[model samples]
Target: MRKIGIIGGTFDPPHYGHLLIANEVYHALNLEEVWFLPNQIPPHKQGRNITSVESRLQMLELATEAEEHFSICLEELSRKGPSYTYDTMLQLTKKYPDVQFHFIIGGDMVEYLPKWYNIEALLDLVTFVGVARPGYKLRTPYPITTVEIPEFAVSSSLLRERYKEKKTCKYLLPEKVQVYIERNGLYES
Candidate 1:
């Protein structure tokens, strides 16, 4: 079976940190490809301001342009409603019946896995690749593998706000993304 890695998020503006994680996980998990899946409607950020789906997907395209193994999925975004992890997993499993999927997530997400919609079924369908955080000894009740430990704490929302306030985020985001944000008036008024 083909081993594929999936990185799912809002990806408001995909950055170097995301790239680093993708690269690290791709190698660490021996993945044949890493698919970047941007959510159309993020459940965690409900009622908050987020960029449009088209904008987020465009940024993802820009972020993964240089890597052939990296690609974007719009299956959920095009499905016409709130995107749920379980729904996406079911479709993916049906489409690729012979492939093994690794769903990448963070430490906090692992702690809240039970709260997700159809969390148990999602686990039954795919492997969860949990990105480890320092001092996090939590384990889930499913097939979960932890990524190498680290303390990387960069937030895309923080970077977006900095851009809105005209603050320097020189080293916070990718140089190309910074330029795109500035040129396209992403967060800035």
Candidate 2:
């Protein structure tokens, strides 16, 4: 029986917090592997200027390459549209019949589950796993599994702000990711 944890994000520049959540969910659910899925054009992110998908994918590759069980999926990227979870999961479930997918969402996003596009219908395709940070104890009736992990307040938005100010990213970012961002001069806006 194969189990995979899937975490979807904009990943403007994938940082340590993203890794921490994937790793935590992987362990908590005893998953065989964790997949990092990047959005092409998330519905909620349509109006904003996003980092190029190629650059985001590159950063994710560098960030997750060292981990043996880490994987990346480009379903949304190649499709060229607003990446809807229900649509993506439907395709994946049909494509990979044997592998069970556990969709990972952090504590904050749990509240938005009810509004997710066709969330109730999507449940048949995959399980939603929400990661917690200490008091991230949110109770919901969406059949989501909660996994508590050590707290870390790092995010792509926060990291981008830090870079724009030429502040030290330090432990919040992985080494190779830091090099890629510097070489590309990204987030200097």
Q: In candidate 1, which residue pairs get closer than 3 Å at backbone N, Cα or C atoms, i.e. clash?
A: none
Candidate 2 TM-score versus the reference: 0.94
Model 2 spans > 4 angstroms off: 133-139
TM-score of each: 0.91, 0.94
User: Once model 1 is optimally superposed onto the true structure by TM-score, how far is the C-alpha of residue 42 displaced, in angstroms?
Assistant: 1.1
Tens digits of per-residue lDDT for model 1, 1-189 = 799999889988787667777878899988999999898888666788889887788788888887898998877787766788899989999999989999888776787788889987888888898886444545787679887844466668778888788777766567777777788898882
Q: Write the per-residue lDDT of candidate 2 for residues 69-140, one digit (tens) a residue.
A: 898998998796789899999999999999899999877677777778898899888888987744355567
TM-score winner among the candidates? 2
Clashing pairs in 2: none
Candidate 1: how large is its RMSD?
Answer: 2.0
